[model samples]
Target: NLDIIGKRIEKIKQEHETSWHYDQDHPYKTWAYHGSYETKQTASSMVNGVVRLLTKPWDIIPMVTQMAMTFKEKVDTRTQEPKEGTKKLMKITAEWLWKELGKKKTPRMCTREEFTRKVRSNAALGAIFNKWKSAREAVEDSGFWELVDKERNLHLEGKCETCVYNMMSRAIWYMWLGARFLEFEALGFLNEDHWFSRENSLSGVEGEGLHKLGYILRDVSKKEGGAMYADDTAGWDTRITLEDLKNEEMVTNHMEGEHKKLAEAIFKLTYQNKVVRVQRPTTVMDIISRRDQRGSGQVVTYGLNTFTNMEAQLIRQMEGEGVFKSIQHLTVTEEIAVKNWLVRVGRERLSRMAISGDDCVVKPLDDRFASALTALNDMGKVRKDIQQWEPSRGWNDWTQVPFCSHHFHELIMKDGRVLVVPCRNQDELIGRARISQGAGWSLRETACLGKSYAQMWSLMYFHRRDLRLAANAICSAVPSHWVPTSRTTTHEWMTTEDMLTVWNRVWIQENPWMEDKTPVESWEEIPYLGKREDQWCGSLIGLTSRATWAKNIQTAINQVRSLIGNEEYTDYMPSMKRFRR
Candidate 1:
């Protein structure tokens, strides 16, 4: 009695004016029943559901419900809810699909544990450490240290290569320096994806863009890989979100060991495209020869202005006669002659324009105030409020600004330097302290600050300028800063040269493209020495020596502090400026 529907029945023949109206609007007519069978259908429904959601303007609830069913991930028998594991698997599948589609993986939803495992799994860190240990043991047992001098100069060597090398160190310094006080807010380039984004009008595009662009680069990626933190895992270890990274902490705790070191090595340069300078290879030299041409020694140079290495060396010798006493007392006009003079500096190679040019100038009166000037300027937060002077009259904010007076003043010291002198203004003093505590005072002579000092010395010495201008005491004399400190510390089985040699054994080899390739399946040491050394230093000892040099500088600072009097002394360490943090 209830049967009204029929599968088939005799069709009614149409009369003279019979017609069939097309039911195209019925949506079902637009569908296909004989679906394609080439691929897995579970995914097919998922793709269909996704397309319907995007193209048909469907609500997410229904679309996701259908898609989840289509995905065929196991759900509870009674509750019909998907398990977390199933969802995780589906997400992984989606990630693989993205790579095939030539797109960046979706922003990671990795939990803390998973992220940590991914980081430790890299095994690159272990590789660098192993080689360094082997090199150190062999050199230590053998007596000759010069044969293993300065870590074998494994890094790239062209002038441009040097810049790229210096660039990473500089970026690391700025991040850690800002991170010290959590003054990270004052720094805009730390974790930004685009310095020129709409919210960052001051630092974005061509107008406000100039400052930020020249300062920061190679920050992030959708695909992550590198010596430090990768794009996917860059900011995870802080155990804090973006808000915690910034806008908080007036005085953060000191970061120690590999945890803190690696965290910083991986922090964001904040560039979107992720084009790091060292990651490039075409023009980079295969190996660094410790001895190389520095510059033409024109009236001025890249890292310093009027000062020449000859002057640094001559002054180094003259310190015996006390010419360096005048260094600390030099007037602003006199200081301008060396500390703030503008000179030519550039890279030597094709596919490159001259690097030498008028430099970015910062306040030279107080290095305390000068610290972070470029960063603040680059952020476009407070440029006009402070005076921006000409290169001839001020220190160039770029290329080679020094963090501490020791970098420029230590050459004047005699034997046994100690005691720390605090800055006039505590707030300003905090700025100077950060330059050391945060970034770890480096061999500024070659890399920065003393770049002019080192270059001039190296150039003059290498070119035998000492011989050419030997009689001209004023022209070829070494600066007081070049004189080695009398307060050299003892090493168990090593001298200064031995300690420097230890640096040779450690440090990761450079394979710039390694970031883009598949990771190593197993950890193994190479039988032969590689040409270019990228990430240097492996053993804790290598870093310890580095730490020791910093100690030497602070010791010199403390000695000055004592002379200045107890009222002028505030405890300071090159790596730890104060206990405030």
Candidate 2:
């Protein structure tokens, strides 16, 4: 193994982590992956893009050396889940860098500029920004524009026409760095929609208020969309569900084949009254969404996708030699089984603010002598002794990860019962090994891990007696008659509501807003209220987040605004905002 893996590991660790919440302020330099899809697909994927001018038609993946993820996905035998790793891709690129034009040419700065350019461009004008000529002119005439433009242009030896050009150029450059992680996409002054969504829309919001919001946004008219997961056909791909945590390709060219450089500030940013009259624009427009001055155009349809790109980029940059790459790996050996478990039961990012370590601290040292009792406590069993251990060192009990897919852990229940249901997804064939996990949890441990997620979901929502029949039919669609191994796996659930609740906890854990106790005295809500399934299964976006952050960060936030009217914090916009004190 290339000894550099440890260095890259250290780089990502010191940088905190990369995730799929792309905002210009938190560019590829700061990846924050949540180990799930909602993160990868939309935010991190867009940010972690590999920009290469060499290959004419060949799709070469970006070599994000420091790319690291929270969850170490193993081929589960209990569940037919796929194992994901960008390490292979990293290895390929790292090897290439080492062999050719690397040690001899890997200078302090890649100043050769022969065949490569940073994700940002120095072009004076972009096609997207040109479309906003009227807006640009108006700003140029304004005092803020006159003074700032003169200063910027004089510095760059540019004219007023190229003022916006230079600003956009530098903005894109910083943006390539700022909008690294998708998580930071919607942070800061740009988040008027976040406030509105919190007020009228939803994130962690609950109750009749949210229900009313939902009724208005989703059920009001044909103009509004219906239930998010209305039916399998209406949603994304059918082969996948929330259970597929790794989701899509861990690292692939999302916008590479279809990548478009941002040309200008978007219309939404220019026009004042964006919130109320803020209809999503079709074509892209240049708009500076983040405080870092990183500008891009409006492309709301892919907002979530853009978020993914930022996150992936963060991981890539965090792996740089001066950052995470310089840290040394710990001597510890246990690979933490951190899937989504840590969200609700996670380590707070703030705790590490004062921490200074030259190491990638995944499995921090834990003094907990984990017997079966401590193990149970670690899994959030709510034991009295462990409950009192709160508010101590970060992840005080952060210990060895348990080996999953044992016969002991069948199915978890709301009432705290465990059952086993012998089942199989024999059809899933990945890697050389035919690894399978929960292919039989539903059928084998019928009592403890009894009742599949579908069975409970059908009962909770459908109430129809025939729903059971539907559940069975759903099962027969795939192979149910095979012994499992490493390649195949399936995450099990006892009930849909249970699934939702579990995910809710995960969501709260992943977000800094959720953990931050400083309460906003009061808040306004967003105008839109996505359907219930959308709100609940939104965390089902894990695979989505993974897809983004695992690869490119630039594509995560493709430059856009949802509300032009409510420009004053009516909702949250991570576009141009990330670090706000």
Task: Please give, for residues 1-581, the per-residue lDDT of candidate 1 as tens digits.
Answer: 00110100011112111432222332222111111111111102112111121111112224223433420011101112223322222222223222321222111111323323422332111111122242224223333233222111211110011111111201221111111111121222212222222132111121211112222221111112211110011111111122211211111112333333322322221210011111112222111111111111111112111111111111212222222234224444532332222111100000011011111212212223322222122211122223642112223322222221110111111222211111111112112111211123333221222222222222111112111111111111212223221111111112212211222221112222122322222111111111121011011112443344333433434443343233322231211222124
Q: What's model 2's TM-score?
A: 0.17
Report per-prediction Cα RMSD to one decimal: 32.1, 28.1
Give residue 133's error in model 2 in angstroms. Answer: 41
How far off is model 2, as Cα RMSD? Answer: 28.1
Per-model CA lDDT versus the true structure = 0.20, 0.21
The number of clashing residue pairs in each candidate reads 33, 172
- Please give the lDDT score for candidate 2: 0.21
